[PDB]
Amino acid sequence: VIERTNGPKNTDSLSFKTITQELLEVTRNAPSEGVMASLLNVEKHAYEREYLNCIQRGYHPNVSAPPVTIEVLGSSHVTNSINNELFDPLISQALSDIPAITQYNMHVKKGIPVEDFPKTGLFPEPLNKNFSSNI
Amino acid sequence: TRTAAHTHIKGLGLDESGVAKRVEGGFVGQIEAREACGVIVDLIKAKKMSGRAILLAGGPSTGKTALALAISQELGPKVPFCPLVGSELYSVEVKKTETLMENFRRAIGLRIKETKEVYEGEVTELTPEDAENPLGGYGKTISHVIVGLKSAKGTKTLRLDPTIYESIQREKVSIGDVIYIEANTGAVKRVGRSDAYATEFDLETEEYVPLPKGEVHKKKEIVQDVTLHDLDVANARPQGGQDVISMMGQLLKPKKTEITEKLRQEVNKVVAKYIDQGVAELIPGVLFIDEVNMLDIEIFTYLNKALESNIAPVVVLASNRGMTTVRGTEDVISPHGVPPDLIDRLLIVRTLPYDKDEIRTIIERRATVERLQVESSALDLLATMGTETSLRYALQLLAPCGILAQTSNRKEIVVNDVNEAKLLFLDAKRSTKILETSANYL
Amino acid sequence: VTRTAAHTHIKGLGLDESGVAKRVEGGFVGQIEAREACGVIVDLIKAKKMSGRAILLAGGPSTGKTALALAISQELGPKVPFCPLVGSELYSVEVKKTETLMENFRRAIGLRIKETKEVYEGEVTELTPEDAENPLGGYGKTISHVIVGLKSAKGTKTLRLDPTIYESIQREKVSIGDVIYIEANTGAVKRVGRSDAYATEFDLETEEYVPLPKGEVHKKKEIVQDVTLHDLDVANARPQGGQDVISMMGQLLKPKKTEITEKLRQEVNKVVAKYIDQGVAELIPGVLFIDEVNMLDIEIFTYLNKALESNIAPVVVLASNRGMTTVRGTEDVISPHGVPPDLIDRLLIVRTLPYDKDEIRTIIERRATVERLQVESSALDLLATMGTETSLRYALQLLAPCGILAQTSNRKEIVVNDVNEAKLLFLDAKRSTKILETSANYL
Amino acid sequence: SLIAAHSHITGLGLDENLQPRPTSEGMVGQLQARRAAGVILKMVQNGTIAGRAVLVAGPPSTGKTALAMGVSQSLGKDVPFTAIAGSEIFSLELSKTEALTQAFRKSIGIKIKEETELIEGEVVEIQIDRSITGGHKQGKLTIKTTDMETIYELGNKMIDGLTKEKVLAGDVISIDKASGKITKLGRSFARSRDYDAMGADTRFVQCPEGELQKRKTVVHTVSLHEIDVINSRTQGFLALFTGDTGEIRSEVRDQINTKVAEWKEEGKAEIVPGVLFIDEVHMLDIECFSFINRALEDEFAPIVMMATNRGVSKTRGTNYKSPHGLPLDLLDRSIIITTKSYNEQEIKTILSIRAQEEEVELSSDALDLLTKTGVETSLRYSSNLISVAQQIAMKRKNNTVEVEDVKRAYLLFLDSARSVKYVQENESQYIDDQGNVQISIA
Amino acid sequence: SLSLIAAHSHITGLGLDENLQPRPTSEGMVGQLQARRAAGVILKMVQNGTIAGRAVLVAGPPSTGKTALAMGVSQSLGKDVPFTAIAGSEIFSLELSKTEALTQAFRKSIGIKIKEETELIEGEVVEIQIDRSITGGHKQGKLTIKTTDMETIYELGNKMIDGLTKEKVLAGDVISIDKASGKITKLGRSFARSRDYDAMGADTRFVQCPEGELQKRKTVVHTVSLHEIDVINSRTQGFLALFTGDTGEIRSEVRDQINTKVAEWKEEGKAEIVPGVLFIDEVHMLDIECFSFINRALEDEFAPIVMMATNRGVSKTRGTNYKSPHGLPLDLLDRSIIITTKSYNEQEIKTILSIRAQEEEVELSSDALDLLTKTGVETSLRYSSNLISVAQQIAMKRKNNTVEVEDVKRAYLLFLDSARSVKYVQENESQYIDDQGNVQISIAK
Numbered sequence A: 001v002i003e004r005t006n007g008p009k010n011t012d013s014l015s016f017k018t019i020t021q022e023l024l025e026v027t028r029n030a031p032s033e034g035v036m037a038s039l040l041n042v043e044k045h046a047y048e049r050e051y052l053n054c055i056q057r058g059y060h061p062n063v064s065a066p067p068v069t070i071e072v073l074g075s076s077h078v079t080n081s082i083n084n085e086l087f088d089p090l091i092s093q094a095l096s097d098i099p100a101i102t103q104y105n106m107h108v109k110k111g112i113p114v115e116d117f118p119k120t121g122l123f124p125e126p127l128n129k130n131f132s133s134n135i
Numbered sequence B: 001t002r003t004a005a006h007t008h009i010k011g012l013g014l015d016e017s018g019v020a021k022r023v024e025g026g027f028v029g030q031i032e033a034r035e036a037c038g039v040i041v042d043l044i045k046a047k048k049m050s051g052r053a054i055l056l057a058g059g060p061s062t063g064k065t066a067l068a069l070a071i072s073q074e075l076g077p078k079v080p081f082c083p084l085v086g087s088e089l090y091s092v093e094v095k096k097t098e099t100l101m102e103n104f105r106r107a108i109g110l111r112i113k114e115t116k117e118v119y120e121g122e123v124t125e126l127t128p129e130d131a132e133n134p135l136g137g138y139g140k141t142i143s144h145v146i147v148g149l150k151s152a153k154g155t156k157t158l159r160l161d162p163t164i165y166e167s168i169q170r171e172k173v174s175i176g177d178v179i180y181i182e183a184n185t186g187a188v189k190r191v192g193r194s195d196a197y198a199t200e201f202d203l204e205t206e207e208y209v210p211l212p213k214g215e216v217h218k219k220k221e222i223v224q225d226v227t228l229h230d231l232d233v234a235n236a237r238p239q240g241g242q243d244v245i246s247m248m249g250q251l252l253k254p255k256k257t258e259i260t261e262k263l264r265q266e267v268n269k270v271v272a273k274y275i276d277q278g279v280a281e282l283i284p285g286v287l288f289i290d291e292v293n294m295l296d297i298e299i300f301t302y303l304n305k306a307l308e309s310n311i312a313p314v315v316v317l318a319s320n321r322g323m324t325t326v327r328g329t330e331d332v333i334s335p336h337g338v339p340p341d342l343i344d345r346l347l348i349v350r351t352l353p354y355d356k357d358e359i360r361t362i363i364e365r366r367a368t369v370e371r372l373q374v375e376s377s378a379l380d381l382l383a384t385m386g387t388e389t390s391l392r393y394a395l396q397l398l399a400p401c402g403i404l405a406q407t408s409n410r411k412e413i414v415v416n417d418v419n420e421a422k423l424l425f426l427d428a429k430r431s432t433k434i435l436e437t438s439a440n441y442l
Numbered sequence C: 001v002t003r004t005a006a007h008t009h010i011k012g013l014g015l016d017e018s019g020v021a022k023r024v025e026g027g028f029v030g031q032i033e034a035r036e037a038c039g040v041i042v043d044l045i046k047a048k049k050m051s052g053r054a055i056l057l058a059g060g061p062s063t064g065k066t067a068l069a070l071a072i073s074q075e076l077g078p079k080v081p082f083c084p085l086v087g088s089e090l091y092s093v094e095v096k097k098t099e100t101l102m103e104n105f106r107r108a109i110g111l112r113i114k115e116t117k118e119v120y121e122g123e124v125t126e127l128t129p130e131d132a133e134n135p136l137g138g139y140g141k142t143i144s145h146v147i148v149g150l151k152s153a154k155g156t157k158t159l160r161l162d163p164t165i166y167e168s169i170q171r172e173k174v175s176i177g178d179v180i181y182i183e184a185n186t187g188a189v190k191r192v193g194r195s196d197a198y199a200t201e202f203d204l205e206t207e208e209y210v211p212l213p214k215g216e217v218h219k220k221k222e223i224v225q226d227v228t229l230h231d232l233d234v235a236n237a238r239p240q241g242g243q244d245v246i247s248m249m250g251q252l253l254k255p256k257k258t259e260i261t262e263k264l265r266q267e268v269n270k271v272v273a274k275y276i277d278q279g280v281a282e283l284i285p286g287v288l289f290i291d292e293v294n295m296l297d298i299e300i301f302t303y304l305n306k307a308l309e310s311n312i313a314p315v316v317v318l319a320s321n322r323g324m325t326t327v328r329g330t331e332d333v334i335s336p337h338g339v340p341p342d343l344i345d346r347l348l349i350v351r352t353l354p355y356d357k358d359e360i361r362t363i364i365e366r367r368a369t370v371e372r373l374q375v376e377s378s379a380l381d382l383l384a385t386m387g388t389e390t391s392l393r394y395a396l397q398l399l400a401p402c403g404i405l406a407q408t409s410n411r412k413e414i415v416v417n418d419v420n421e422a423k424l425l426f427l428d429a430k431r432s433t434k435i436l437e438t439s440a441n442y443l
Numbered sequence D: 001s002l003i004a005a006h007s008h009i010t011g012l013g014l015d016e017n018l019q020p021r022p023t024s025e026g027m028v029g030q031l032q033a034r035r036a037a038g039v040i041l042k043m044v045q046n047g048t049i050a051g052r053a054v055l056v057a058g059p060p061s062t063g064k065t066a067l068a069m070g071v072s073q074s075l076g077k078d079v080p081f082t083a084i085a086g087s088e089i090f091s092l093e094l095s096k097t098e099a100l101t102q103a104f105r106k107s108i109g110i111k112i113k114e115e116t117e118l119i120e121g122e123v124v125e126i127q128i129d130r131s132i133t134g135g136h137k138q139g140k141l142t143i144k145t146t147d148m149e150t151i152y153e154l155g156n157k158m159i160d161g162l163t164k165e166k167v168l169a170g171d172v173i174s175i176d177k178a179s180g181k182i183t184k185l186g187r188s189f190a191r192s193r194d195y196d197a198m199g200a201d202t203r204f205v206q207c208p209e210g211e212l213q214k215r216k217t218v219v220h221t222v223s224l225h226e227i228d229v230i231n232s233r234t235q236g237f238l239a240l241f242t243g244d245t246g247e248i249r250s251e252v253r254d255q256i257n258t259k260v261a262e263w264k265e266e267g268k269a270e271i272v273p274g275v276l277f278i279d280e281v282h283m284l285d286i287e288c289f290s291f292i293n294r295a296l297e298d299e300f301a302p303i304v305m306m307a308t309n310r311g312v313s314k315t316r317g318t319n320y321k322s323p324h325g326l327p328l329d330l331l332d333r334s335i336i337i338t339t340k341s342y343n344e345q346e347i348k349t350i351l352s353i354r355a356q357e358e359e360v361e362l363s364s365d366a367l368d369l370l371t372k373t374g375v376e377t378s379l380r381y382s383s384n385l386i387s388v389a390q391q392i393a394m395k396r397k398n399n400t401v402e403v404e405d406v407k408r409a410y411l412l413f414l415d416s417a418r419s420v421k422y423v424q425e426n427e428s429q430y431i432d433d434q435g436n437v438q439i440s441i442a
Numbered sequence E: 001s002l003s004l005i006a007a008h009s010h011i012t013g014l015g016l017d018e019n020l021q022p023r024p025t026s027e028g029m030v031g032q033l034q035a036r037r038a039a040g041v042i043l044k045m046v047q048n049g050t051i052a053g054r055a056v057l058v059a060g061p062p063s064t065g066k067t068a069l070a071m072g073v074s075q076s077l078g079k080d081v082p083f084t085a086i087a088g089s090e091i092f093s094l095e096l097s098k099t100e101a102l103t104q105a106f107r108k109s110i111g112i113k114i115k116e117e118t119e120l121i122e123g124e125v126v127e128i129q130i131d132r133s134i135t136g137g138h139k140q141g142k143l144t145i146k147t148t149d150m151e152t153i154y155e156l157g158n159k160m161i162d163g164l165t166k167e168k169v170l171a172g173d174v175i176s177i178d179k180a181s182g183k184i185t186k187l188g189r190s191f192a193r194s195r196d197y198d199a200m201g202a203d204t205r206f207v208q209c210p211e212g213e214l215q216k217r218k219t220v221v222h223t224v225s226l227h228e229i230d231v232i233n234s235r236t237q238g239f240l241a242l243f244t245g246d247t248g249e250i251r252s253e254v255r256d257q258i259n260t261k262v263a264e265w266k267e268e269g270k271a272e273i274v275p276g277v278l279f280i281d282e283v284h285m286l287d288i289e290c291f292s293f294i295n296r297a298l299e300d301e302f303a304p305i306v307m308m309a310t311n312r313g314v315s316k317t318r319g320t321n322y323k324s325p326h327g328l329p330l331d332l333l334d335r336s337i338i339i340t341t342k343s344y345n346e347q348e349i350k351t352i353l354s355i356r357a358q359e360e361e362v363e364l365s366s367d368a369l370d371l372l373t374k375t376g377v378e379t380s381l382r383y384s385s386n387l388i389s390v391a392q393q394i395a396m397k398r399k400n401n402t403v404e405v406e407d408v409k410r411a412y413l414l415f416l417d418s419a420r421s422v423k424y425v426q427e428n429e430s431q432y433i434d435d436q437g438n439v440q441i442s443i444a445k
């Protein structure tokens, strides 16, 4: 999922576009007051009409817990494997973002191109500012 | 050229302001049913009503499915028509009520017309210019982007926004490429290099689209035909997102879900708003359910509920049962396997069996459709065999007779071929006779 | 003004200090022996010593079985947990009925924990990261540390943040000038709002403005929490609340009920026993109420036989209104109240009795008092005679159409003509059955 | 929309004394049931009591769903009216009690009051600062009116709303703070020098004068089930449309109840109850009835209206027979409204109203024939014959339905009784209960 | 190979002439002349391909040759034509409806034929040189590739350069690039460099260096069923569903679009339609819903020719409460033609046993063959067919290369048929668990 890129495919093939994929790709960058974009923006209009971005949280979980720890006494390989599985750099970089001054340092003062950056910013946004935490 | 039990029926064959004739449109006889279906076709073309149900009942091999396909042919290829069987509503992913509602929404069409302003052609130049007073701490402050386009019998240089240079660099548009610029959105997209830039490298993955015709700038008025279920399934799933959930759901199995009433209500109100604006218009269609006796009483009750909706199409049902127990019940004896609550909400069209000359005419029509030459005495023997055993048995035995005539190097079917086909292939009655006379587990 | 629905005229069992029930107090009329038995059961629950005790409320329809359970729940108080169920709720399509029954068993055992939190809080003044040597080295993150400058009232601290904390910091989208709240127990960060030391009327994102937090940046506070054992079970079963990859992905997947193994329950019991032995926890057993117990079948009854013999299970209160009925899931056994005899042997049946004319009349009077209506004496006598003749519930539910018909005639009292018109407009079960018997086409 | 079965009913037709007029608001006859439904409607509009069960019973084609539609039309907007059938409870995704709980909680509305600020002005300067990957976005906005000039700070959602329907420094925009809605009213400056990519053909409006910022008070209605689905998980707003809300736990529901009581205490929100209508209630198991018997006794319970047409039939899930298909526990705590059959005058008035709704002009003799055939057969058959005779009427090119059109429509389409007569006469041609048929005609 | 001697592997096509007249013994088929002529007629119907949606029914007593006839039709059909063979019990799935499973089985039996051209340049990479411009907008490449005979120099585009950064080459890997298509693949490492890096690794593999002409031309022909196109266009990466079966109720609109595009490709001339045969063995356990769906689905233009085999008498249709001939409803039997099969006599049984003994590499004497023929006359035929193969092992254990009458008698005494087991059960039924669960364990009363 993380490493997937929108590569090109040749035209002479049996995999063509469905009508639903055409409906999807029409409203990617379409502006407002167009019939197709407004016909495919039901959820955004329902979000704006219902004043949902200023609603409050009514539910909080009672107990929050980390995953169960597994220990093997007298072995360092299991600790490295557990630290690699729990704190995988690829997934944790996918669920976060790089700071802006760090991006400026690697793009300009280090010569790294934009396409060689790790994948960032795949965490889904919450409904409100209140819905981002349990405290 | 492929034929399968049909495709000799071309419309109902009615004259205008009148009734059916005898032999027209591949139909022989069945005059009252054809007139009733023509009245139903005119009602559908009137485009005013909602949720009218028609059940046509009769014996087997009478032409109910032929009548439904003739209705769908008479309506045209633009009005929606969803054929269905009663066994198809029992799915293991979602409840039967949701499948019935999905097939209800599949039969309502929409016609949307738009206008597109298009810049396209081969890129001739791409000069991102730089401003008179640049700001410190930055590089190449862009004031505008000048891009030259070249197409067939016309070229035109443009003067674009500085923001579109970011999308140009994103989509890797270089020289010699063909691009596609619409007016309001910006959003440059690239189709490929020209055919004139193909023979400078031996090996390249990239295809070479030819240079497009017409001028650089043009207006095309397009018309898009979608159904209400297409809008529901497009709004229900999210668009191309930038989260793990939408990418993960795109690569997994597309499991069906229970579409809520709220989404359909919002789709209905935005469709009504744009219908009032004068852009779109509504084309209701036909939902055809063959073998309606296979439904149980829960689907019948939900059909009673859904036939009173404001957006339901016309429903056409067909059945061959008599006084038969309704499925899902133990002691409800009802005509055609349909409960009386549903029967009270519909109209019944009666279909009648044929006689010998109509059987002969139908056999002759199916023979001349299949490009077969039949002798007259062979035709009479086939008609006598058909009226003795079955119409479908005489229709299905025509191809082995043609194969046996082709084996003996001739282009005509005579009495010996139909006798050999009678000897080789049996029917239901003779099979039942040889099963009842043998006790060897036959 | 207030909403009333078939109850809420009942505030308790209405007993004195000796356990003797009054004839009419606490919203109850009659049923003296059942109320005294329920008071004994209430004292047994408040003793907090027994485990796996069960009683059964047997009686006819409309006699006060659910009313006694709600009176028990009101007499216990809100601190003691109380889980009301219907018998049809145990059949789920996500998990077997045995696990649902065990879940509702564990949902009725409370716990009170004094919890200590290590809290860093203040106003963000400096947010400065520094980079790694090789960001494209494949292993290790892009940055190495983040320097955060926090300012509270009468204090100021600087912190060098771990990157794993910084993921939760930047997921909250904090900035310079925001008041934050870092919980060191889990690493969770709450962004309170923009500081009021700067300007206010130049924002476009309807934010909330908050003063500086009092006291020092680093704090320790004690928090009293109320937590059931089922909450701990589902917290450990689906772990959300860490800062790891698995705990992050646990919040995004669709939740589903799973068969929680007994090993997790033994581990949770061991940890809770350690917390009790440390002196920071107190165990509050509760009541599980299963109304309409005849909807259960023989498999749930057979599992309930085992589940009542554990050392954790709370007091279970059942109810039924069947005389001699075959148990569901069987063919030919016949048992009282639809409850099999092996389960009946572990119960304590509390009998419930029907009412009289005077009890019906005073119940009608009190329910008309609660609904803020004025009823004449002759209309009250007619309503009591109707309640004896047809049903108590039918005379109960005819009060509000009578009030509407009185209000449409511009009156406050309820008179005989309104009762007669409500009789003529609205029917009961017996008259509808008599109409259906003399009907033409299955009316 | 289209013309439905109950499209001619707008309200209940009652005066200020709750006395039904004989012919008003599309409802004729049935004075006792209409008075009782008006009493129930006033009980709902009172909003004081909760958890009352009302049962509507009678023969088929009597006006039950018509009465429910009249109640829902007289209820008005902003009060939830959940209308479901009996077969919709059974799902492969939720349990029966969970679906019943969701259907119960969909009928309670919460009216939430919000304080917002409206900003309308002319855009002067836009500065947008974004990172290299384009993730972290911030900037400043300088907007003006004819009197004031203010610089605002922008977040991510504001920048996303600006970069869609792109504003170009001189457009007049309107921003709602609490809703986050950006509306481009038009362009006031009308700049000459423009890039030749976008249209920018917006209408010419004036620059607004007066105060830039205005406080306003807005209200909106949100159902309880919406709040449970939203607070259930991370992406509950998608689950409000996709219907993937699988078995919400009880802790969420009781915390939502506590928060709703807190909001009512604070004066922020008020509770608006509604009506839940369950048509064809006899298609429910006894477990659903056992759940309803306890769900009716809660404070957060709506007025439940049930409709049925069964006599003494078998309760589903058991092996005994009960009146209306309902056990006596549910019949004890419910109040029954009984509907009665019609005369010929009410049938004539109904047919005249339905002909006026469908824009069909009838002669007096055609109306008398339709009244007679609706007395003999069912009312719904004579209601359905009107549009068919109408299409026959323009098939002979006159816009008035005469007696011969009704005679031809009676000839082409059949009743329930005539089809039964034909099946009982020609039983050998239809498949019976044992699967026996005779296809051959010899 | 990966094929052992199956139940009927001796049948290679129907034994017919050029005038569709069956020979008495040819191509492994003995007797059953009328059914063989009917199967030849059906085979010519399939090979003509202009008739769509026909249902035939092969009905007969058990151990007669209905499945043998279907195997003969499949063998005589040849390659590159789809022949689907499913049982009646396979469509009762847990993740798919019976209608969807039947639709997938219908669409697996009709395919399209696509022919394409390939210009393969297969060889070992010697050295790659990349030229970058000062602007960097384009990259030029000089590729030095070789076979065992000769080596040329090729110029490369930037898309080649980016395609060779992925699945990277290390000057000695064997690749093959197309000219017109430009498909890039990495076959593996050459055998000449196998003693270089001292440890292989994870993904690497050693292949021989290709020899001969560097640039080859090859025309290949593909046959794709419609179900594969449905599965491919249903998802984003659909071939995993093609190999794991996790399709899950593909919608109807994609099927309509695929049918329309197949008709468009046929009209243009890109592809041609190859029909096929669908064989449903043991059709008598299908539900009535599946029968109604078959009745409706047989009338479409994209329908194959359905062959159904059953051996039931007048038996109960599943899902109903009545009986019917062949276990099939009468409306399904109306739209069908029945090929009946007849039982054998002594001579055809002897010929079948001789052919089966020839196939299983077993030599029998004449007396042993006559004894097995008498046993197959009295008992069934499959009993004698198994008796041959166990008597061969008995004879080999007796250190003899031929099967005699004593070995056949020993195999007859050791292994029982149905009738002797029925008699032994009915004589000592107190020792067996009956239908009430009563059994006597102890031997002393």
Ligand SMILES: Nc1ncnc2c1ncn2[C@@H]1O[C@H](COP(=O)(O)OP(=O)(O)O)[C@@H](O)[C@H]1O
Pocket (backbone or CB within 6 Å): B005, B006, B026, B027, B028, B029, B030, B058, B059, B060, B061, B062, B063, B064, B065, B066, B067, B320, B362
């Ligand atoms: N009036 C007719 N004219 C020509 N062919 C007919 C007519 N009626 C029926 N048929 C033929 O009969 C065949 C089967 O009829 P069908 O519609 O399946 O009847 P049913 O659906 O009642 O079994 C069709 O192939 C059709 O071509």
Ligand SMILES: Nc1ncnc2c1ncn2[C@@H]1O[C@H](COP(=O)(O)OP(=O)(O)O)[C@@H](O)[C@H]1O
Pocket (backbone or CB within 6 Å): C006, C007, C027, C028, C029, C030, C031, C060, C061, C062, C063, C064, C065, C066, C067, C068, C363
């Ligand atoms: N002793 C009582 N005093 C006042 N009201 C009562 C009494 N007993 C029963 N009721 C009323 O009778 C109704 C039915 O009682 P409940 O226990 O809820 O049902 P059931 O008795 O059928 O289980 C309730 O609304 C309750 O208010």
Ligand SMILES: Nc1ncnc2c1ncn2[C@@H]1O[C@H](COP(=O)(O)OP(=O)(O)O)[C@@H](O)[C@H]1O
Pocket (backbone or CB within 6 Å): D005, D006, D009, D026, D027, D028, D029, D030, D058, D059, D060, D061, D062, D063, D064, D065, D066, D067, D307, D309, D339, D350, D379
């Ligand atoms: N008083 C009335 N006003 C308007 N329409 C009526 C009236 N009475 C009956 N109808 C019509 O008769 C039918 C009643 O059937 P339905 O609405 O299903 O309720 P029920 O099943 O209780 O009769 C509806 O089609 C309705 O249009």
Ligand SMILES: Nc1ncnc2c1ncn2[C@@H]1O[C@H](COP(=O)(O)OP(=O)(O)O)[C@@H](O)[C@H]1O
Pocket (backbone or CB within 6 Å): E007, E008, E009, E028, E029, E030, E031, E032, E061, E062, E063, E064, E065, E066, E067, E068, E069, E311, E352, E381, E382
């Ligand atoms: N005509 C035949 N020629 C050769 N072998 C045959 C013939 N008919 C049947 N057999 C053999 O008989 C065996 C069982 O026959 P089978 O086809 O399974 O019977 P059924 O069709 O009743 O299932 C098969 O192994 C097959 O090889």
